Amino acid sequence: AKQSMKAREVKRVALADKYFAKRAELKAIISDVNASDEDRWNAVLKLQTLPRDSSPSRQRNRCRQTGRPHGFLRKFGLSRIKVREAAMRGEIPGLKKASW
């Protein structure tokens, strides 16, 4: 992937980090059935106000080395290609070719 995409993501991550408490509180308010209607409306409007990159559902998991969006794995934080390279080169602990 490009440098720019990586930068965008980093930004998005930063924003998620920043606004977590507020966004979560707002979600809770909106959910809370034992609450005033006007308050709920205020909450949903307030959610709208916050930045979009603040959402965690915006950020895409990439390879931590290449930034490749597809073929990702969570345990390793790497795309399939780089993961395989890692297995071969010995740098992933415990990982070896499996047969059964």
């Binding site: 399939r80 290609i81 395989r84 415990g94």
Partner: protein, 99 residues
């Protein structure tokens, strides 16, 4: 009683670690329960090995996390205290828990 949960990828290494902790226990205290083997976690992964496109071309790796449950029935003064200075070989995550 002190339950101890040894976890590692290498099984020979974990075995060595189990032994060593058992010795540490036995000299100081008395009635070590024993090195019980729990089930191993075989976390498998499939991946495409082609850079671009060959879907049937694949490699299937796995990680074998091995578990060893060692238990100490009588915690004495000396015994529990030994363990603090007696660190184990690396790549072996231990997990002690009294009671």
């Amino acid at each position: 009683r002190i339950r101890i949960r040894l976890k590692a990828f290498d099984h020979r290494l974990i075995d060595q670690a189990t032994a060593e902790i058992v010795e540490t226990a036995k000299r100081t205290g008395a009635q070590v329960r024993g090195p019980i083997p729990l089930p191993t976690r075989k976390e498998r992964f499939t991946v495409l090995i082609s850079p671009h496109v060959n879907k049937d071309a694949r490699d299937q790796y796995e990680i074998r996390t091995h578990l060893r449950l060692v238990d100490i029935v009588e915690p004495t003064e000396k015994t529990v205290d030994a363990l603090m200075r007696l660190d184990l070989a690396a790549g072996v995550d231990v997990q002690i828990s009294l009671g």
